[PDB]
Design a protein around this ligand. Structure first.
Ligand code: ADP
Lengths: 15, 264, 12, 16
């Protein structure tokens, strides 16, 4: 979790 | 047969969220384009078309999504009334921008549930639509989900029942509804026990066909709207929107889709 | 970092 | 413009 977002491109978070 | 097809003057076409919106809640620029292209071409032939749109919910939702995400913090670890506002803005934008490519002018006329109970509002709308659809102007109707609070008229008053009633009110014919399936299958399309029907007999079919299992609209409302419009005196044809050239074949004297007429 | 943790893509 | 385009595809770990 934390790590996932820690290393993600915001555009991705939109996924 | 399809003898009524050759002699229609005022045609109404309705597009649901199943066709206007594609994957990722993004306007299906493809289908939405091809169909509006063909509609502009058809209007350039002198016909009088009526457009009903249903994609406010989805586009709205996506846009709000983005706007929220743009302003969020670690939250990465919506009310329709707004979704619809933004969705309508966007849909109307696309329709216009796309229709300005063929010098076809469209005016957005929006109706609400608490408006069709008035005795003279129907007459006023009839006169204004008749006046507007004379200089090759295409009007666009859609349920105004923003102001909407909720029997009114039309069950669940989705765009299907709205289109059926509106075509029943204004003297017109050939109610065309665009879905993602190539007609009214007698059953679920996935199952092999499902065959397309050329026609529709009220007493033979309605009792025994069984179906059911898309924010705007919903099946089992389409059939009721079609039957209550056809028994009112307006022919109804159902055809898929995945091939926008289908409607041109409909309006030439060729048999595709399902029928709903006063005949038996 | 805690700052970045607390911001908006808009913020950046 | 292009800055926005990039940020969009950037990973938090790259904004440091
Ligand atoms: N009798 C049937 N024949 C074919 N398809 C059906 C039938 N009943 C339900 N469906 C499917 O159910 C779905 C419901 O969507 P529909 O209400 O038709 O469009 P929208 O949700 O845009 O109003 C349709 O996509 C359709 O394919």
């Amino acid at each position: 979790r934390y790590r996932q977002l820690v290393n993600s491109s915001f555009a991705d978070l939109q996924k």
